[PDB]
Design a protein around this ligand. Sequence first.
Ligand code: NAG
Length: 195
Amino acid sequence: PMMPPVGVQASILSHDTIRITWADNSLPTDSRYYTVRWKTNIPANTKYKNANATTLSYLVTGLKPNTLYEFSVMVTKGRRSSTWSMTAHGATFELVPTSPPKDVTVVSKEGKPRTIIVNWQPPSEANGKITGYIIYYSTDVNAEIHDWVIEPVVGNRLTHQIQELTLDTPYYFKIQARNSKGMGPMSEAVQFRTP
Ligand SMILES: *[C@@H]1O[C@H](CO)[C@@H](O)[C@H](O)[C@H]1NC(C)=O
């Protein structure tokens, strides 16, 4: 039985890249190769992805942003092979949201016709901790973004009330998520006509 690699470390490079490094004790030049394996910590049922390396490091790419991964290495030299090394852990950096806030809806507030309530769900691809949202509304759907009225939502709140709206007026609403990295994409405009 071959000696498994030691001193396994993870170096975070981006939202999709982690460098894995290790040491091989069976070295003081031959046909040996290392196999790096990784899977996300959660869900616990995740199948391992793996790659071969001929050096004492491997660049794990195509990872998901803001995700914790487990890494382990083994060595093979022909018919002989080792077990999996100690596990190294590494969580990719955050990235701007890459998806809009889901399930956007607008209702009129109970007994307040000039008041509306916006309701939504966090984006599917938040890619980090949501630091807020930005609501935009307009009487004209085709108006340039600066012409839309800005209504910021602080923190991961999933509701926001907008008061003093013109009656019997069709309004248009769209939202974008915000994280430590910036603004994500906008939702498709939802139309709502005030009573
Ligand atoms: C690594 O090399 C071995 C031997 O050539 C092979 O069985 C294995 O499929 C290779 N790894 C990948 C990721 O295909």
